C-alpha cells in the first residue's frame, strides 16, 4: 500500500553544501524507499554512484550495479535545482503529465558519509528513496541508526529499509 512522498519541508538540505567535495565515488550502504522492500529471496547487493562535477555545476553521474552475468553502468545528469545541494534530472522540471526527478543531499561530511533523497514522478505517482552513502562499504552503527530514523521520519516502515550486501565485483 501506497506511501506518499513526504513534504519537501521534511527533507533538509545540507548547509554550506560543497559540490566540489561531494564528487567522486559513493557506495550505497543503505537504501530505503516507498517501493523498495527487503527481499530475503534475493537480497540487494551493494551498488555504487560516481559523481563527476562539471564546469556548469551539473554532475555527470555513473551508477554501477552488479548483475548475475555482468556489470551494469547507467548514466544520469543531475542539473542544479532550486537550492544548494538540490538537483533535477536532465534539467526536467515538475509538470502535470511528465516524468521528472529531484535530488537532495540531506546530510554529509564529504569524506565518510552522506544521506541523499531521491524522488521521481512515475506514471502519475511519486516514488522516492533515500541512500545512505559511504566512501567505504562499511559505516558505523551510529550512522546506520541515524539513516533508519530519518527513513522512518519520512513514513517508511522497517521492512522498506535495506542494507545492501558488501561485495567486490563491479563496484571496486
Amino acid at each position: 500500500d501506497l506511501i506518499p512522498a513526504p513534504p519537501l519541508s521534511k527533507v533538509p538540505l545540507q548547509q554550506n553544501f560543497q559540490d566540489n567535495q561531494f564528487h567522486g565515488k559513493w557506495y550505497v550502504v543503505g537504501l530505503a524507499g516507498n517501493e523498495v522492500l527487503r527481499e530475503d529471496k534475493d537480497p540487494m547487493k551493494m551498488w555504487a554512484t560516481i559523481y563527476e562535477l562539471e564546469e556548469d555545476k551539473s554532475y555527470n553521474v555513473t551508477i554501477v550495479m552488479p548483475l548475475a552475468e555482468k556489470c551494469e553502468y547507467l548514466f544520469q545528469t543531475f542539473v542544479p535545482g532550486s537550492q544548494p545541494g538540490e538537483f533535477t534530472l536532465g534539467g526536467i522540471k515538475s509538470g502535470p503529465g511528465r516524468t521528472s526527478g529531484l535530488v537532495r543531499v540531506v546530510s554529509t561530511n564529504y569524506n565518510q558519509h552522506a544521506m541523499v533523497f531521491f524522488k521521481v514522478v512515475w506514471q502519475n505517482r511519486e516514488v522516492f528513496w533515500v541512500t545512505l552513502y559511504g566512501r567505504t562499504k562499511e559505516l558505523t552503527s551510529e550512522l546506520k541508526e541515524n539513516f533508519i530514523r530519518f527513513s522512518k521520519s519520512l513514513g517508511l516502515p522497517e521492512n522498506h529499509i535495506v542494507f545492501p550486501v558488501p561485495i567486490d565485483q563491479c563496484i571496486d
Partner: peptide, 25 residues
C-alpha cells in the same frame, strides 16, 4: 518519425525493490 522513449533511473517504479531504468509506457 524517430521514437524517443522517456526513461529514468528509479529504485521502484517499473520494478518493486529493484533499481534500474524505467521507461514510460
Amino acid at each position: 518519425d524517430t521514437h524517443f522513449p522517456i526513461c529514468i533511473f528509479c529504485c521502484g517504479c517499473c520494478h518493486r525493490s529493484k533499481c534500474g531504468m524505467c521507461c514510460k509506457t
